[PDB]
Amino acid sequence: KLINEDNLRLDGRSFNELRPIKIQAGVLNRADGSAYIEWGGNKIMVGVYGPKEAYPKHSQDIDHAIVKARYNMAAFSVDERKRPGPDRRTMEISKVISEALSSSIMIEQFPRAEIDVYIEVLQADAGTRIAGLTAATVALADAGVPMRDMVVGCTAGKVDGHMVLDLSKEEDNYGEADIPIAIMPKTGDIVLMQMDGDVTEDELYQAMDMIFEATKRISQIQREALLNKYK
Amino acid sequence: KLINEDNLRLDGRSFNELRPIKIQAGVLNRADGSAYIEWGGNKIMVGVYGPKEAYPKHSQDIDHAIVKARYNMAAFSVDERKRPGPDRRTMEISKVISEALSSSIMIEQFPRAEIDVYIEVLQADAGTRIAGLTAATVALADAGVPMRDMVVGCTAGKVDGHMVLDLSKEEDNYGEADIPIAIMPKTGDIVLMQMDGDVTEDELYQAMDMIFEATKRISQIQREALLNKYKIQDIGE
Amino acid sequence: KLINEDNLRLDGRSFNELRPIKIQAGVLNRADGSAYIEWGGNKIMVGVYGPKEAYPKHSQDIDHAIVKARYNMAAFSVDERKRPGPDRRTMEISKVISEALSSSIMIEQFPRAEIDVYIEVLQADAGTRIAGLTAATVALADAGVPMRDMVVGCTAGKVDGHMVLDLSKEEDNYGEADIPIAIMPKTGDIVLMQMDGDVTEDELYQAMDMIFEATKRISQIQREALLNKY
Amino acid sequence: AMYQLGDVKKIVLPGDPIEVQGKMRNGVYRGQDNRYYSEYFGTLQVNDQFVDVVPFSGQYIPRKGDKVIGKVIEVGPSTWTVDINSPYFAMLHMNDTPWRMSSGDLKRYLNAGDYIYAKIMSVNEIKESWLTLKEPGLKKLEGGHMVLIHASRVPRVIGKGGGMVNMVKELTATRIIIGQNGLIWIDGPIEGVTMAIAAIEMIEREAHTEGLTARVESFLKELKGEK
Amino acid sequence: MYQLGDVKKIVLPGDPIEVQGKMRNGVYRGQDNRYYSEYFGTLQVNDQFVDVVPFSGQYIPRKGDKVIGKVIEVGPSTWTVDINSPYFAMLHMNDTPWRMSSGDLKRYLNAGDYIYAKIMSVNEIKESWLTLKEPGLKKLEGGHMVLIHASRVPRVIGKGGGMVNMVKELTATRIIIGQNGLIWIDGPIEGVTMAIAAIEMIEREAHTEGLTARVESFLKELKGEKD
Amino acid sequence: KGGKRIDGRLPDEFRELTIIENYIPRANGSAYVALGNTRVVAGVKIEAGEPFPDTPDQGVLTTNVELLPIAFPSFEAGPPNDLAIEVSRVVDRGIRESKMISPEKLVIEQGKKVWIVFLDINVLDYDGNLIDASTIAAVAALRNAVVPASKEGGEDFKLPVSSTPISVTMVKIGDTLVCDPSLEEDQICGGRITVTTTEDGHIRAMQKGEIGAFTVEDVKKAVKMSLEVGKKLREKYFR
Amino acid sequence: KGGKRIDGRLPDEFRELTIIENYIPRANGSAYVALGNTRVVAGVKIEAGEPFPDTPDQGVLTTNVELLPIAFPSFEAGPPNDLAIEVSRVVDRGIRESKMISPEKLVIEQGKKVWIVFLDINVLDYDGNLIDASTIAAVAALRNAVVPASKEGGEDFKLPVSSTPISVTMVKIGDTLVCDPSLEEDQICGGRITVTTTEDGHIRAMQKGEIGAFTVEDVKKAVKMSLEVGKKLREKYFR
Amino acid sequence: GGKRIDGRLPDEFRELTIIENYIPRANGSAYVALGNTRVVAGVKIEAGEPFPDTPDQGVLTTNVELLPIAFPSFEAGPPNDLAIEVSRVVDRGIRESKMISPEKLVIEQGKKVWIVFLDINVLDYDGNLIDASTIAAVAALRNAVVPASKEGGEDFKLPVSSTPISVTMVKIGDTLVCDPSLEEDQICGGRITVTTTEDGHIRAMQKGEIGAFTVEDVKKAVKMSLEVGKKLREKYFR
């Protein structure tokens, strides 16, 4: 019933060890920018369209652009076949991702514009929403969308009294906490943050530093995924 | 369990024999153009409204008009009671009939316009999708909609190794194939064609030739239904 | 099986007795006009927004305003938890109330306008639809929406051969008839009237007279409601 | 070949071949074989030189000069869009009105939903109509009841020289405006409108009888005598 | 820490730019008063200015470009034209060769008509104003519309327009190329296939010398191979 | 006016009616009805299903009226569902409250299987007064009773019909109350009233619709007129 | 200016609260909450149902928050469900992860029947800070626990309440973090953070909302404040 | 001109890449890229209640999602008609070819059968969705893997009894071509899809879009669809 035996997690990682992460950018042909990510069992496609003016003028917004990110899960993407289409869960994710991306994208550079980010998760492991946000910045730099930073993030949480990094599906369902956080690496500003479970003030501050130091290991992947386009 | 004994179908027809067909045009009062059809067990009402200048968002497509044919089944029309409203099947039929009709309607004559064809099947036997299109051209002619031809069609298929015409509901469910086809008679051009089941290249061409022969008889039922409405007397058809 | 033994109803009332009714005005902050109403077990909140211009202009109607009353039931308002959102019943109720309200609101004074009436039932006894409408007129006057009268109404029906007033949920489900009616008190004109069940002409007129007598007292409870608030 | 008549050369269906000499006009299209074929179900009316196909339909084609009643559907910054019961909506420019307005003030004079009795200034190739209100008698219609009839029966309802339409007015005690588009504006007393309607429906339905005037006058007197 | 003699070090969004010169498009000032890259791109320095060109698309319009655009909305005095840019461009009625009154914009250009126009001005928000008054600017009627990357437009036209003109005669077609990547093609039913086929070969393979010589050989083979 | 409406009809006169039983022979019961130029066809579909938990010893009747976009030009512009729903509820109300069906006799295995009565009405042509047209169609269709009891073993019997409810719609043209309004008369006056009656002289259902008011006397006249014209309608077609 | 917010409130002060337990008595448990001019009413309906197949020895708790159109002029323009759904999930996350309910004791028949606890919150009046008001109302309504065991035989007992989760939502005005933002302050600044805490000093749920970013110091101060105003609140209204 | 707009001849398909077991958490899955049209098919098999009429048969349900990531113009249109047609066309090919053998998917006759969910997500649209979905659909059903260990039993391979190959064809000018790219898909109105099995039989046909075909064109489309269906079967579905 319990998650670790030798200070070893069910999948054999130490406490602060990431799952395998791959990111290829520019995989899509039609999309202005695109990024494919593999994070554990997660396989997520992201494509980015825009910035363009809205037609008809009704949905327009005169201050800045609008980031409309849509997170959708394939019917074969979860354990039991799920009905296609958004639900309460995907709608909460699409908002929280849209809000974070609005903070790094230089939204004042396209007034009255709309920026579509389509995140299609084709197979889902845990922490799924962050692999899509991690890929959203990759697709956005592919599309020439101006950003002041490349948002990046990772999960942490409490499992059998220990604070661990990048929880697996088993660790999420039966562990004590899950903390997804996404930051602007230049500043350390948090643009996404949720938390589930049971944690002390001390463990939460521990969890944060763990994520913060995993962001450096992740950002490198993102930066290497756009760098392989030229070469 | 078999459909034929003496080369006679369960309902008594030869292979290339139509079921009884009726068409009356201009039977609806509100519709700009209308047509009723009875094709075997099928009872289908057609209404045509338009063309007009529309209204809704990105519906003001400037090249031509828009044929919005909507195929709808009454809840009492099929074997088991069906929920009111369109479904996945009725939306597939609505497209294929709209595509077909957009080829005979002279669609360029009304840019920015919209043309509604509501096809309401009140009772369905097999091959309903053709019976409605066949009545739709009558309802379009009744409404003064310009057309370059009167689209007409018929169903065919394989039953116990033989190719037969105008399949019945029993022949549709238990046959080997079903092939609904609609054409423009002048030219022989195909605007609507589907096919389900299992058939050889040779049998399929034989079934095409049977449908082309039937369109001669079906076209004539369409024509007379228009002639009838505002009297006939003296000759000229 | 039956509702009465000593000519007494299940809750102890006589035949023509109203259940207790309270109405408090100006209870919402955001709404232009508001009214809380308690009618027996019924707890109904009404809020009024408007009159203002319609956007988009598509739905605009250009002779007069449009009264959009929306009747919604809270999920915890009925016996078993019901899934939030409108259904066939609540749409019919929204229309029949929108229509009745249109007869008293001076609709012509605001062409192209919209007037929103949100009726949120938090807890439902029988006769809900009159209870909101009776509270609705209060909200409308609380919002300054011009009216030519204060709509008021009441239910009646037949239970074991006796014609009774303001039926309860039990008497509604198992009684023989239910007749909800709403009138304009100046003229006595009926702006809302429905009828379910089985009744003779004679009983139907008896039920009407009983309802007309009760509306005098309910209309005063409406008057008081507006009075205190200022 | 097939049967033809002496001046109206037989009834035709969409796609019937037209083997007649002359300048092909509305109702006829040229097929891929360079032959001509019928576009409509109708009669192959063939006038001098020109060769049409008139159809058996409705959908009133508005042409220059017709006086029509129309409902304003949209108020633009400089034009009103008016539905004249025709496949395309008609336009009324602000300069084609007797009102002095600045641009954007169009809602003070005509709102959407308002009915107008105007004249068709022009019809372009697409049947798009431009309207005017400057001539005497053209005006906004306020109050009353609107009736729709088929435009093909409007000419009998008006009658030669406006006799029929006037004659009704006095028997029916009402003001009546008839559009060439089939819209008729009626406003009288609450009663007068009822007789006026009853008469028009009899006229439209029975628009073949020569003694139409007689019946319609008597039918209105019979409804008049019965009160 | 890094960087070459003149093209420095290819940057990512947010990489710090510690270089002297006038910051221009692609660089923003952080809260720490340092400059950082806005784009994933190349840091481009000349004696006066510091930029980061990105590896992107979304063609920006600059004054003077001749472009193809699809009209999306017909205003009272202006047309809204999509020029394949983040913002729609505006064509006022007074920048046209047509004498029109306000609201008659639909007689000359409707939505969806494609026009070959010239960029009159680009404001700070990249909104474009168009004109059609100069010779050669016109409505495009009929034909097939092709989109290629705007960065590939100069090679497809070629030095002095030789390549584009050369195809036209080889393809027996009229071809108009807009700086936004939209290419208008209308010829015979066949020549359109070759003109398209040539453009994709030119777009994909733009960087080789003798690009002129392939297109000529490729087009000559296509004419021969059915004959 | 002087005893006539806009048509020849007197204030208490209906339009010409044609009722056609067994119009949809593949349904359990059906009927096409034309009321003047208003045309609807109702269809009755009977199936075995599970009863409601509260009433385990009763069959089920569910009613639906489709205002098909084919029936009117302005239909699907809107389409406001409000009118289509009201009619389905009002029509249902007459049939249900008249106890026409006897839904206790439709019990197959008490609390496990009952008979589901689908009563579906498609409007093909709208020329006013949908309620009365739908009710006539509904009643007539229920009279091709034909419950398929051979499918649950048993024996195909005629669905029990215990009364004949007739709905009557009334409006006030000027100062006179008329019934069965045409579409034109339906627009000359705001305010209509439906009163459904049975052959026993009982009122089973009432419904005031549309914007406008009726005085108590008007309501009194409409009850008498609906009873009277309901008796006339019952004798002509529902012998 | 004087250490005070746009109203007299200090950075750590909530608005006036009024909690009215058993506001909807015909429900098993209920609570009306007014937080300034933000008004919501939460209702709990407990019913016997089938547990989820994976956890057969545990009852179910489902939460749903209704942003009624009465509550704001702009409501039904939009209405974006995005805000209404988000509040449902945050309120449910705080209640679920605090283990307030103790759902193993809600088992009637292991693996067949458990107690399903519907928590529905209707927002009647909107003046900012829906998240905290909704959580308070939900907590209070869950304390009128009254689970109806008498319908399943047994004995009516109090639904077990094992903790007191108090959520506090915080926004950044200028350089200072304040809590319980009014509607003015909710729009004055992009960015909010909600921290739900139990009386044991544990953090049970967090949620950053709206467009905008927070430094790590801000987040540390928000967790510290939420525990500190969360403790003050717990003693004042949930003694 | 004797060749197409690309190097393709009239009977040449674009480059195909098929990837079996692309979604290992699905019972069977396959990614297919046909040129720049990219879809991934995923099969989820579960025990459920059969349809009342056929209580001794399994169920096959098909659904094709045109995800908005797949094309810029999506939500301009996007016509839902198109997504639904492809689901029905694709399902028709699998059903009428008797690929699935739905009688062997019976767990408890008249109570429990195997429901085979075939869900195809379109990620990139560059024309010819129908053939690309069929290829993904055929392959994904060949990672058959029905989870019979959850119903006791034994995990077996879902029976696949035939290999239907669907071919979509358009007429550019006077020449019929197959596998139309998006560019060719718009250069001529009117496409025709003919699905064939390895027995030389035609199992499904469908005329689509606005436009007409002569009787000879349909005769050429059948010859070409059978012939290129044979090439495709031998190259990827041996």
Author numbering:
A (entry chain C): 10 to 240
B (entry chain A): 10 to 246
C (entry chain D): 10 to 239
D (entry chain I): 0 to 226
E (entry chain G): 1 to 227
F (entry chain F), G (entry chain E): 22 to 260
H (entry chain B): 23 to 260
What is the paper's account of this structure, in its own sentences?
The full complex structure of TaciRrp4:41:42 was solved at 3.5 Å and refined to obtain an Rwork of 0.23 and an Rfree of 0.27. The structure belonged to the P3221 space group. The overall exosome structure of Taci consists of nine subunits, three TaciRrp41 and TaciRrp42 heterodimers forming a hexameric ring structure and capped on one side by three subunits of TaciRrp4. TaciRrp4 consists of three domains: an N-term domain, a central S1 domain, and a C-terminal KH domain. Based on the PISA interface calculation program, it was observed that 32 residues of TaciRrp41 were interacting with 29 residues of TaciRrp4. Among the 29 residues, the majority (17 amino acids) were part of the NTD, while 11 were associated with the S1 domain, and only 1 was related to the KH domain. The pore created by the three S1 domains had a width of approximately 11 Å, allowing enough room for the single-stranded RNA to pass through, but not enough for the double-stranded RNA. The neck in T. aci consisted of four residues per domain: Y64, P65, K66, and H67. The neck created by these residues had a diameter of roughly 12 Å. However, this ability was significantly increased when taken together with the TaciRrp4-capping protein.
The exosome is a multiprotein complex that participates in the processing and degradation of RNA molecules. Several studies have linked exosomes to the quality control of messenger RNA (mRNA), the turnover of cytosolic messenger RNA (mRNA), and the processing of short noncoding RNA (sncRNA). Archaeal exosomes, unlike those of eukaryotes, contain only two RNase-PH-like subunits, Rrp41 and Rrp42. These subunits form a hexameric ring where Rrp41 and Rrp42 exist as heterodimers.
